[PDB]
Amino acid sequence: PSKVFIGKIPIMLRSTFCILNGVSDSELYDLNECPYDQGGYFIINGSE
Amino acid sequence: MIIPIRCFSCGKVIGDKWDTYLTLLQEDNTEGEALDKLGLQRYCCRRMILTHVDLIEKLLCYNP
Ligand SMILES: [Zn+2]
């Protein structure tokens, strides 16, 4: 094939394919997050 | 964040009376009623240690 890049798609926090998903509470802090956040939002251009 | 210290209505100090409070409702099998053993006859302020949220253990773990 060719595996070529085609623009970029903004991910939604706490998803099946997010950077967190299966992360334990004790490890959410290390990352400066909050065990209460329930995702739902996008952080495009720096703002929710 | 941490007990208020000095109840809202009276002056009765409550900064002292928590390091000892929590060591009963989870460490002596006494009731919410146990605070009565801390000189809390008034409403009053005694709804101070009771209606409180320990928001610092869960805030302190953000180390710079
Ligand atoms: Zn009072």
UniProtKB/Swiss-Prot annotation, chain A:
Domain of life the protein comes from: Eukaryota
Localization annotation: Nucleus
Assembly, per entry: Component of the RNA polymerase II (Pol II) complex consisting of 12 subunits.
Note from the entry: The binding of ribonucleoside triphosphate to the RNA polymerase II transcribing complex probably involves a two-step mechanism. The initial binding seems to occur at the entry (E) site and involves a magnesium ion coordinated by three conserved aspartate residues of the two largest RNA Pol II subunits.
Family statement drawn from the similarity comment of this UniProt entry: Belongs to the RNA polymerase beta chain family.
Function description: DNA-dependent RNA polymerase catalyzes the transcription of DNA into RNA using the four ribonucleoside triphosphates as substrates. Second largest component of RNA polymerase II which synthesizes mRNA precursors and many functional non-coding RNAs. Proposed to contribute to the polymerase catalytic activity and forms the polymerase active center together with the largest subunit. Pol II is the central component of the basal RNA polymerase II transcription machinery. It is composed of mobile elements that move relative to each other.
Protein name: DNA-directed RNA polymerase II subunit RPB2
Species lineage: Eukaryota, Fungi, Dikarya, Ascomycota, Taphrinomycotina
From Swiss-Prot, chain B:
Keyword flag Nucleus: yes
Keyword Chloroplast part of the UniProt annotation: no
An annotated GO BP: transcription by RNA polymerase III
Record's GO cellular component terms: cytosol; nucleolus; nucleus; RNA polymerase I complex; RNA polymerase II, core complex; RNA polymerase II, holoenzyme; RNA polymerase III complex
Cell compartments where the protein resides: Nucleus
Molecular function terms, GO-annotated: DNA binding; DNA-directed RNA polymerase activity; zinc ion binding
Pfam families assigned: RNA_pol_N
Domain of life from the UniProt record: Eukaryota
Main location: nucleus
Keyword terms, alphabetized: DNA-directed RNA polymerase, Metal-binding, Nucleus, Transcription, Zinc
Binding locations of Zn(2+): 7, 10, 44-45
Subunit (UniProt): Component of the RNA polymerase I (Pol I), RNA polymerase II (Pol II) and RNA polymerase III (Pol III) complexes consisting of 14, 12 and 17 subunits, respectively.
Family stated for the protein in its record: Belongs to the archaeal Rpo10/eukaryotic RPB10 RNA polymerase subunit family.
Known role: DNA-dependent RNA polymerase catalyzes the transcription of DNA into RNA using the four ribonucleoside triphosphates as substrates. Common component of RNA polymerases I, II and III which synthesize ribosomal RNA precursors, mRNA precursors and many functional non-coding RNAs, and a small RNAs, such as 5S rRNA and tRNAs, respectively. Pol II is the central component of the basal RNA polymerase II transcription machinery. Pols are composed of mobile elements that move relative to each other. In Pol II, RBP10 is part of the core element with the central large cleft.
Protein name: DNA-directed RNA polymerases I, II, and III subunit RPABC5
Gene: rpb10
